[PDB]
Symmetry: D2
Subunit: 340 residues, 4 copies
């Protein structure tokens, strides 16, 4: 039963496994103070064209989001996000556990606009309400859409005018920056945000996120906070290794390109069969609307994620591809689908 459930069902790219195997039995200092982390961080600084930035390696996405917000926010400050943002839905109150409110905006396509930021600022006023101070966006978003350069430039400009930090969640940044509708580079993101992260977990690594802190005010003692939240991994050179391999020779983007090419095969198949997607997609996620009878038959050969059942005898399903997805399985899916 081949799985399209998520982009973290396989361990790691063979070249990461190889470096981990060949490096075994060497002695390293702990907590990210080692040679691997230093090399990965240097490589990342060069790709961003911001070698002044601080890079911290952290094991997971929820970990990284709650650390970022806790670094950027005073007790009476809040974070703005879409209602579909990962921090609004699927971190079991992680941000609120740090003591801060997520102010949500209803953006059906999963993308924040300047008008939602402005409206969130208009609604929260006086000493009786939280002060929005951080804006959270995801690229790609939690429904597979993504930002253009002009969109991120508009958001960034608005944040600077109102004194807000801008944080970009890059769980699926490899997919985003490899998509054919994309016109952002890593250097653009580093130019336009106060902080962001590059996800390795969903892009070839067994774990790891690279939290990049660009705004000088957010930098001090970040490692203390990482430690306090349980995120300062003792054998931290193993996180560095993920990035030392992925960020070398364009691998990160080549794997991203593959995941998007796989999803494009599924999408061409879906569209040839008259099946509609709930959101537009040029990334590694698809949200087909399939009849329940068809789903029960597809379940015999593929695992999918159920997003939301609907009253008219259909569900929104999610298909997810990754760096590890077998092209042959994508063509099989389409062939099985055509015959249903």
């Amino acid at each position: 039963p081949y799985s399209f459930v998520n982009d973290y069902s396989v361990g790691m790219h063979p070249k990461i496994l190889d470096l981990m195997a060949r490096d075994n039995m060497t002695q390293h200092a702990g907590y990210g103070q080692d040679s691997h982390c230093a090399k990965a961080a240097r490589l990342i600084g060069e790709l961003l064209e911001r070698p002044d930035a601080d890079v911290h390696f952290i094991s997971g996405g929820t970990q990284t989001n709650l650390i970022a917000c806790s670094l950027a926010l005073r007790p009476w400050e809040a974070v703005i996000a879409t209602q579909l943002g990962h921090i609004s839905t699927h971190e079991t109150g992680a941000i609120e556990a740090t003591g801060h409110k997520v102010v949500t905006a209803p953006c059906p396509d999963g993308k924040l606009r300047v008008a939602d930021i402005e409206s969130a600022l208009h609604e929260n006023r006086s000493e009786h309400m939280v002060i929005p101070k951080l804006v959270y966006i995801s690229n790609t978003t939690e429904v597979g859409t993504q930002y253009t350069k002009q969109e991120l430039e508009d958001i960034s400009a608005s944040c600077k005018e109102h004194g807000l930090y801008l944080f970009l969640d890059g769980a699926r940044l490899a997919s985003a920056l490899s998509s054919p509708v994309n016109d952002l580079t890593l250097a653009d993101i580093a130019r336009l945000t106060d902080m962001f992260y590059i996800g390795a977990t969903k892009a070839g690594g067994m774990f790891g996120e690279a939290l990049i802190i660009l705004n000088d005010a957010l930098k001090p003692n970040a490692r203390h906070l990482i430690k306090q939240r349980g995120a300062l991994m003792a054998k931290g050179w193993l996180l560095g290794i993920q990035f030392e391999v992925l960020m070398k020779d364009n691998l990160f983007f080549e794997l991203g390109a593959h995941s998007n090419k796989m999803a494009a095969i599924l999408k061409a198949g879906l569209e040839a069969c008259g099946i509609r997607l709930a959101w537009p997609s040029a990334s590694n996620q698809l949200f087909p609307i399939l009849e329940n009878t068809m789903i029960a038959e597809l379940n015999n050969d593929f695992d999918m994620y159920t997003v939301e059942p609907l009253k008219d005898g259909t569900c929104i399903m999610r298909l997810c591809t990754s760096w590890a997805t077998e092209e042959k399985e994508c063509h099989r899916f389409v062939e099985v689908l055509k015959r249903l």
Copy 2:
């Protein structure tokens, strides 16, 4: 300029002030372990017909809401409320500062319904989402509407079905229970909720909320939590005195009836002038939609709250009466309004 801004603009009812005056210079034990809090707690127990309820005296409403959520919720649990609820809007994220999420429901008239609770429970599933465990309602609500006994009984039964606690914010319980459209008593509220509070701040007292804990699982060591959040007032007998006067001889409900009656004079003046209200009201709050040019002239004689500017050259205002509101000011508002409209 006479103020209709809110229901906490005047200090306290003269009878409360009288007791504080006569009592002054008498020595008392601290932190609510005194005689006045004991008497207040007993009167409350008898009005609710639950002498087994734990009664805790606390100074403010935000204080009370944050303590109640903290008592009822584990770290991964959450409170359900309307988008207009006090804890969702006007507490500077006090509940979030205790570590908990407020899950909201869009209810345009400020009242939770069973369908909203159910829909909150459906949307929040798996180990990747919070677990809703407490339901928060306000009577009256923050937009001046209020719950009937049947509405509260349906909410209460849905909560028992799904294993949720129900907590009622009674900041404006005096106005609610003295209203002509009301069919709830304090006994009913005690029967149907695990926890609620009776507000004195807005009903005659200088401060004071009485937190009533009814469900036995919420009771133990509540005083430790109150202390921790800075809410265990040293001279606690002074909170007690507020309720020892208000809960005696139906004074609480008589002050509420006065506040509702003053609002009824304002409401009659507004309705004779063709001015519409943004929400229905039989309580102490009114939300007239008025012309901006009208507002600028009213402003010379009266102070009102500005709720929501609209595109079409008008504005939703709030008028609020209290136990202290003067009838002659109410008639005067109506009369200035008729001169303006004509």
Copy 3:
């Protein structure tokens, strides 16, 4: 049964009651935005000779301490205090509930010294430990001792050299600044600290603390935090009234002088009977060591606080006087004691 248990057993000074009674039925704006708070704050600024300071009126001491620490501390920062400090013992984890550690120093006489600050800084180092950032002291302290000007000057200088905020808890500041061994004024405290509070609850008011914020970095949006913690009292002009009466015409200090004169009568009586105090005192608190048999007999006519029973058939008791203490009761205590 006359009570020497604490300094908050009587409601308020008659002149406060009178102003509250005569002001009743006037309309006021809420949340401290009124005329009474403005006048009290102006009076306090003049007494401190720092009219640039921000003054916020808050109802209680625990409330004020947890707000002060939450204003001064980032998530990985901690507060230094003696083991006998109120925030280390008797706030049921209030500071820790805001997310911060209290680092304690063993100071038997209840006073912090420069060497304890320095030692607390030496012990907490690296990204694996909290960063001490705030120093908490009390005047008078929780065992009735108090700071001299030279002591506070030494502490203040050390805090400035190490980049620490200095916060003084003035629950019993009236007693301290009225004592015959005192050489500090309010103006000295305002000169030497980043923040402190003047307690009214124990000095004539029914409640109220005046949180003074001197350090410009601590000021922004303090009212948001006060609101969030439940401390922004709706009818806040009633707190202002306490201070409008107390800080006028030296009343605060005259009441403080009376509480110290009362304790001096008790102390002269104790010392004439050969009874030792557990700490030196020139303030409104005494800590006599009395035999258990003598305590049972004194309990017939006076209520006292039991501090710590001891194995040799004695207890450390606390006697507390205030602005409201009846001189006749103090002479009675001494007369009863002499005859035991």
Copy 4:
């Protein structure tokens, strides 16, 4: 320069790496809902003789400690620990960041005793103080000593008497239970604690702690809390693989025995050279008091941790061995030390 700095300087035991290699490219369900975590959990259940225990796989020790305190404590409750405990010193206030106080006891040899627990319960009374509810111990401790079965049974019985939970930090449980002075098994620890964890990070694994929950009141929705604190690893099968290899064929205890044996060579060299240890040790940590001039020469060949400079021109150092420590480096340390002393 060969390092004796700590017991997490090398990646992982070759057998763990072998399984990860062979398993790579196989698809798995996320968040610990996979086959490897199921097998690891079952092996653990059988070693403890408690197949009813909930086993949760978590990446790090600080992570595990903060989750365990959060599971066991209400907001006004606190954890008792020694002053040398990991949660009192070296977690950047992680427990305090969850909202709870750590109440400490001065125990110079790193071991809690019953008198300490009792004295913590006496000092903390009334609604004005925290309530101690959880006891935290470490085996081995942070200074290399360890608990006997009788010590643990007395601690455990005092906890049952006073209604406290007992939690054991097993970061260095492999070294402790493979030591010659030890008389505890994993079955014993499971019998006498409500919760503990077995550390793989320092005993062969690249990461991994197995949190075992035994008391039924602590169990429900633990996975929601793990998620909330960012500790629910997406590719959770990789944590599982660590224990599926370590808990098979006594490998966990064999690696611990190797680590203790290497330390015994170092300890013998130190004792033949007249050098004293700051605490007694039969585990993988040693705390020699050495001359500063000695240290500067040793530094050219070896890396050690500096614990505490002393006034008299000497210094307490820490030496730490692990499953990966080379015997030839141990003999070499002893030999360089004898040349230096002579």
